[PDB]
């Protein structure tokens, strides 16, 4: 049983880390695409292919293990459970997290990054209705 | 600027929530797939472009407001920067954080994973020397 464990713990933080490595290239790619280099835009996506398999492996070795989502410690075994899960990221994103960091950068004189936290809030609540439609759909027949 | 505020933190962690939102849709998409709904599989699919596009608009403000990567601490400001971090997260990687988590993985009775941390410990280390050799252009 994996529960408990430090193996647990690392195979959370290890998928953190590769879900961040694949933005992080992809968005490294796009500078690169813009500059005129397509070797290493190429290399940058190429490896983001392999930090997807990384995340996926690490999610796979939870699922089987019976862990829970990295992001919102719910389970994923079953398809009805993962969009639960989601709906559940969504929800606190939407009702606190972002309304939470827009209030803050208005606080501290960024209202730009406010505005953004402030769009970001307005389409994880629509995320969310989204998720919820499904698993209506999904518990329903 | 935004180094020192609270703001900064905040970009970093929206920046984390994002990126792994977008990782676990795409996977909660091959289940989908799997089990014939194509629909909310495409759904799913459509949803994680969003998380990437929210992804890279915190890059975008972490970057222009002077801050550095949420993963290596690193600045990002130009692509040869940006090599650079993707370099210093990869040596981390390989160096120490999945040969260490392989020996806790063995030392906890958990050798299938162990060996999963000691493949990906391989992998980063020739992801690392690959990003060196374009550092040089
Ligand atoms: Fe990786
Ligand atoms: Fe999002
Ligand atoms: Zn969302
Ligand atoms: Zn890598």
Redesign the interface.
């Known amino acids: 049983d994996?529960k408990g464990?430090?193996?647990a713990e690392?195979?959370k933080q290890?998928?953190?880390?590769?879900?961040?490595?694949?933005?992080?290239?992809?968005?490294?790619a796009?500078?690169?695409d813009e500059?005129g280099?397509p070797?290493?835009a190429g290399?940058?996506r190429s490896?983001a292919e392999?930090e997807?398999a990384?995340?996926?492996?690490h999610?796979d070795?939870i699922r089987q293990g019976g862990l829970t989502?990295?992001?919102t410690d719910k389970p994923?075994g079953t398809?009805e459970q993962?969009?639960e899960?989601?709906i559940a990221?969504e929800t606190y994103?939407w009702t606190q997290?972002?309304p939470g960091?827009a209030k803050?950068?208005r606080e501290?004189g960024?209202p730009?990054?406010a505005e953004?936290?402030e769009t970001?809030a307005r389409?994880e609540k629509s995320?969310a209705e989204?998720?919820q439609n499904?698993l209506k759909?999904?518990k329903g027949g």
Request: glycine fraction near 8%; charge should be negative.
């Open positions: 994996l464990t430090k193996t690392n195979l290890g998928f953190i880390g590769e879900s961040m490595a694949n933005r992080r290239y992809l968005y490294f796009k500078r690169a500059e280099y070797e290493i290399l940058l490896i392999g997807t990384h995340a996926f492996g999610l070795f989502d990295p992001a994923i398809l993962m969009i899960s989601a990221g994103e997290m972002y960091f803050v950068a501290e960024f730009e990054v953004w936290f970001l389409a995320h989204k998720f499904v759909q999904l």
